[PDB]
Amino acid sequence: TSGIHVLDELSVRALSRDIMKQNRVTVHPEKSVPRTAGYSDAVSVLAQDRPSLAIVSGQGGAAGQRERVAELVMMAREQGREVQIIAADRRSQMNMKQDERLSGELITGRRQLLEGMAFTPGSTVIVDQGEKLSLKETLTLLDGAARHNVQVLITDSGQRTGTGSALMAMKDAGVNTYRWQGGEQRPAT
């Protein structure tokens, strides 16, 4: 009875549909209405809940959009929790830059990537990406961490014409929850 306001995905389901309503918003190029905050408010609220997992599409602004989702990472900075986040194909340049918080403090990126050991899965992951090649590689490693306290918050920059197709794209990255184990044992199949 109590604790029924938020469920495993009921909260995420409602905000995903409203965000898509602006994803294909009836906007004319003669007077395109900018609204980056439209999916910033819908998606940011879902992280305050618990299960971080939604869809977002950008209309204009590429450099400010990558730093914007990183503002969400600050909300985790105060909560004593680091998070792994990847921008579109522009993330490579961000690695040289973006030293205000992602210099190397995600969470299990220490021994699991360099020596084979495992790190306490308990981070939050959000991957904003126009290209889908970035979404699939991030998804494979994230699968192990998602078993514990992790989640996928992502945006996109190529769903303006096809958004539902992008959802299957992430699923094709190897992520598959069976019953006793997910796709953690499927590094490439």
UniProtKB/Swiss-Prot annotation:
Compartments reported by the entry: Cytoplasm
Protein's name in the database: Multifunctional conjugation protein TraI
Subunit organization: Monomer. Part of the relaxosome, a complex composed of plasmid-encodes TraI, TraM, TraY and host-encoded IHF bound to the F plasmid origin of transfer (oriT). Directly contacts coupling protein TraD. Seems to directly contact TraM via its C-terminus.
Domain notes: Has 4 domains; the relaxase domain (residues 1-330), an unknown domain (residues 330-990), the helicase domain (residues 990-1450) and the C-terminal domain (1450-1756) which is required for conjugative DNA transfer, possibly via interaction with TraM.
Organism for this UniProt entry: Escherichia coli (strain K12)
Gene name of this polypeptide: traI
Consequence of gene loss (knockout): Loss of conjugative DNA transfer.
Physiological role: Conjugative DNA transfer (CDT) is the unidirectional transfer of ssDNA plasmid from a donor to a recipient cell. It is the central mechanism by which antibiotic resistance and virulence factors are propagated in bacterial populations. Part of the relaxosome, which facilitates a site- and strand-specific cut in the origin of transfer by TraI, at the nic site. Relaxosome formation requires binding of IHF and TraY to the oriT region, which then facilitates binding of TraI relaxase. TraI forms a covalent 5'-phosphotyrosine intermediate linkage to the ssDNA. TraI has also been identified as DNA helicase I. DNA. helicase I is a potent, highly processive DNA-dependent ATPase, able to unwind about 1.1 kb dsDNA per second in a 5' to 3' manner.
Family the entry assigns: To TraI of plasmid IncFII R100.
